[PDB]
Amino acid sequence: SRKTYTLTDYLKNTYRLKLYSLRWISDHEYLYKQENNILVFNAEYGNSSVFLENSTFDEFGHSINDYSISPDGQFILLEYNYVKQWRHSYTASYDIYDLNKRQLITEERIPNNTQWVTWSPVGHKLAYVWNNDIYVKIEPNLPSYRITWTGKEDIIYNGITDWVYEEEVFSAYSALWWSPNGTFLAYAQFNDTEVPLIEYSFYSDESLQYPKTVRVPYPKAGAVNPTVKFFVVNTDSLSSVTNATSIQITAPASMLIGDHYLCDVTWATQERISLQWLRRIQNYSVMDICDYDESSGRWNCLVARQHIEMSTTGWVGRFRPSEPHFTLDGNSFYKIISNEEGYRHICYFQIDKKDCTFITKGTWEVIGIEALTSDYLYYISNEYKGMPGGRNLYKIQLSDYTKVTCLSCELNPERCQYYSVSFSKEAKYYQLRCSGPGLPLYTLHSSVNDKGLRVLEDNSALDKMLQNVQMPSKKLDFIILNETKFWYQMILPPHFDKSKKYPLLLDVYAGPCSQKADTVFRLNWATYLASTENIIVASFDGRGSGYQGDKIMHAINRRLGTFEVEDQIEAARQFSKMGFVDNKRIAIWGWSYGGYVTSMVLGSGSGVFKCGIAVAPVSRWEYYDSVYTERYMGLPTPEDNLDHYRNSTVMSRAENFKQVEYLLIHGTADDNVHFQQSAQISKALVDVGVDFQAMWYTDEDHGIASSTAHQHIYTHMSHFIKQCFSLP
């Protein structure tokens, strides 16, 4: 094949993976943008036409970042002046374009710097947040109605999340929820008045004379958390004269006695809202069912339909309590619950009755419930061949739980072992999406008899280009430590020769419920390390890893920095035994939790690792955020888990770093894992006299993703790995 997958190829995207992102707009049609045209496809027949021509806005003026078409296809939202904030948040400008008239709405426009915009599920109503306040427009061209007047920057958030709720709880900036009708608008309100601020310098452009201090309400472990409230407003009865009436739904009494979180909102019907609350000690959760009382106009949460979730061995759910999927009538629902043996399976709950009925069981887990029809429930699981790192679509016959059909397994067993799915409205069709081990495959199907309709993108263009390259192969297997199987993967150098000895690089994450050993196809830094530098890149899923039951996932409860660290070390020992690993050249690196684990490993004095790299690592759990840290570590108080908070830092292992070559990297504007974390690691090493290599990235955040920084850090790390392994 002559050539290899080079560093430049990775940094420059020489070999591009193609995708097929569609947007379902009904039971049978989806939108797709080919070039800069928006085409509408008919799923059954496959015909399409151009919905919006790439030239419709050539004279718009600004560069359009994104668009959003109303549910009734009458109007389209135009998103420009995009300015990113955190992982999900950002601000932008919006213009609405009438599809029937083919003209831009110019009256009662949406304000610049809008924080969030969303159409109603039906019709064409809009709800947006500006200045931390919620506004509503019944019609695109009509004046908006103000819903809240309490908005205040960095203090009161109406309709949007504060920093911690965005990152750790809702995984979104949005905090608004239209009802199926488009009648009610539910929204949460966060108050960060007593939440401490994390401050750090932002240097900006060279022209700025004085560095700017960024301040963000951020609750570190054990600090004051933000408080939350929930409201519901009737959108049909809005008046231009009187102020909107927001009905508040209060949290259960079992929640009010202390700090808690609103962790899930789900409309069950036009008049029933489901709410899940979580105590600050995340081992107790409550699901509330609230019904609208047409006569009084209020919402009542009967303590009859209250469903409780507790956990003795750990925390609730994988990262948070699971989402409930209601059947049409709203009287019952399904949700993933850890079963009697610690394995997560689908549960059937009937509103006003006790317990639930498990409809799936076994030594494997359900990853997620994807669709729910009158006859079947569709879900993704890692059941096939007992490979926790594989994923397939299955459907259960609701009138007979024993009848489970696998919908993806046999489609192409050698190329596709990791699917994800996207169903149309009412699930009449579904786009299957395979991520590996072979090249990504996108296909369309009809639900009726699960007939494959057509291929959407098979990545033939990439396949041909790679045939020209000496690509590395992937090995997915397991080792038995005690009586348990622990999975691992190895990116192996082309023309792999087990008689030879290769240097090994342990690529680490290892956080709670993580999975680094899977069947996914990836073109990344490790591909370059194996293809051009002949390095073996390995990952190992030890205790604490997810999707293999609680026995494995909860072994790390209240003890972060122990078993996951010991297991990475034991894995490298194991790999050494295999005659194809030069034990004098074993490195290790990781980003974020992987950075923390990597440092913890390097500082263990195990003698197994020559060098390692840690990027933006956590160094002391009291520095990281409350929702994430408290979930696994409890509170940093004497009565609780303060001792392990104190015995699990990277700083106390400083002396042992004199036995390795360490490279510590971190962005100065990191709002997630504060530069402080590395500032303290470096200081501990200086005080003990250990030499080490460092690199800061000015104004880069946790991702260090800007194109220049991205290219730079990977070039820097590559040089570091080559010199350590003596690879000119």
Ligand X SMILES: COCCN1Cc2nc(C)c(CN)c(-c3ccc(Cl)cc3Cl)c2C1=O
Q: Which residues bind ligand X (CB under 6 A)?
A: 167-168, 509, 511, 592-593, 618, 624, 628, 672-673, 702
E-only strand ranges, 63-160:
66-69, 75-84, 90-98, 103-104, 116-119, 126-130, 133-137, 145-146, 156-158
| Choices 21-29, 285-293, 302-310, 620-628; region in contact with a second copy by CB under 8 A | 620-628
Nearer to ligand X, 437 or 512 (CB): 512
Tell me which of 42, 193, 213, 357 binds a second copy, using CB under 8 A. 213
* Spatial CB neighbours of 200, under 8 Å, sequence gap ≥ 6: 213, 214, 668, 669, 670, 671, 674, 675
Active site residue 463: no
513: nearest Cα among 560, 477, 574: 560
Q: Write down the residue that tokens 């949700």 correspond to.
A: 335
| In the complex, minimum distance from the CB of residue 668 to ligand X, in angstroms, rounded to a whole number | 16
| In the complex, minimum distance from the CB of residue 672 to a second copy, in angstroms, rounded to a whole number | 15
Nearer to ligand X, 349 or 624 (CB): 624
SS3 annotation, 667-702: ECCCCCCCHHHHHHHHHHHHHHCCCCEEEEECCCCC
Structure tokens at 373: 């029809």
| Choices 103-111, 335-343, 377-385, 687-695; region in contact with a second copy by CB under 8 A | 687-695
Active site residue 652: no
Contacts (CB under 8 A) with a second copy, residues 435-474:
none
Rounded Cα–Cα distance for residues 441 and 288 (Å) = 41
Active site residue 375: no
Structure tokens at 462: 């990439």
SS3 annotation, 332-357: EEEEEEECCCCCEEEEEEECCCCCCE
Interaction partner, residue 293 (a second copy, ligand X, none; CB < 5-8 Å by kind): none
Binding letters toward a second copy, positions 222-241, x by CB under 8 A: xx------------------
Maximum distance among all Cα pairs of the chain, rounded to whole angstroms: 83
How far is CA 89 from its chain centroid?
14
SS3 at position 155: coil
| In the complex, minimum distance from the CB of residue 509 to ligand X, in angstroms, rounded to a whole number | 5
Residue 676 near a second copy by CB under 8 A: yes
Contacts (CB under 8 A) with a second copy, residues 179-198:
196-198
Interaction partner, residue 628 (ligand X, a second copy, none; CB < 5-8 Å by kind): ligand X
Rg (CA), the chain: 27
Rounded Cα–Cα distance for residues 154 and 216 (Å) = 7
Interaction partner, residue 712 (a second copy, ligand X, none; CB < 5-8 Å by kind): a second copy
Interaction partner, residue 630 (a second copy, ligand X, none; CB < 5-8 Å by kind): none
Contacts (CB under 8 A) with a second copy, residues 646-675:
649, 651, 668, 674-675
Which secondary structure element, helix H or strand E, spans residue 264, and what is its range?
Answer: strand 260-269
Nearer to a second copy, 149 or 203 (CB): 203
Nearer to ligand X, 75 or 163 (CB): 163
Residue 705 near a second copy by CB under 8 A: no
Q: CB atoms < 10 A from the CB of 580, how many? A: 18
Pairing of strands 260-269, 272-279: antiparallel
Interaction partner, residue 168 (ligand X, a second copy, none; CB < 5-8 Å by kind): ligand X
| In the complex, minimum distance from the CB of residue 197 to a second copy, in angstroms, rounded to a whole number | 7
Q: CB atoms < 10 A from the CB of 314, how many? A: 21
Nearer to ligand X, 218 or 624 (CB): 624
| In the complex, minimum distance from the CB of residue 515 to ligand X, in angstroms, rounded to a whole number | 8
Structure tokens at 167: 């990152």
Alpha-carbon dihedral 707, 712, 715, 721, rounded to 10 degrees: -120
Interaction partner, residue 200 (ligand X, a second copy, none; CB < 5-8 Å by kind): a second copy
Interaction partner, residue 697 (a second copy, ligand X, none; CB < 5-8 Å by kind): a second copy
Catalytic member of 670, 674, 678, 718: 670
Nearer to ligand X, 168 or 567 (CB): 168
**563-577 and 593-602 helices cross at what angle (nearest 10)?**
70
| In the complex, minimum distance from the CB of residue 317 to a second copy, in angstroms, rounded to a whole number | 28
Rounded Cα–Cα distance for residues 596 and 672 (Å) = 14
Which secondary structure element, helix H or strand E, spans residue 227, and what is its range?
Answer: strand 227-234
Residue 209 near a second copy by CB under 8 A: yes
| In the complex, minimum distance from the CB of residue 439 to a second copy, in angstroms, rounded to a whole number | 31
Nearer to a second copy, 391 or 620 (CB): 620
Nearer to ligand X, 182 or 511 (CB): 511
Enzyme catalytic residues: 592, 670, 702
Q: Residue numbers of the site for a second copy (CB under 8 A)?
A: 196-201, 203, 206, 209-211, 213, 220, 222-223, 620, 622-623, 649, 651, 668, 674-676, 679-680, 682-684, 686-689, 691, 693-699, 708-709, 711-712, 715-716, 719
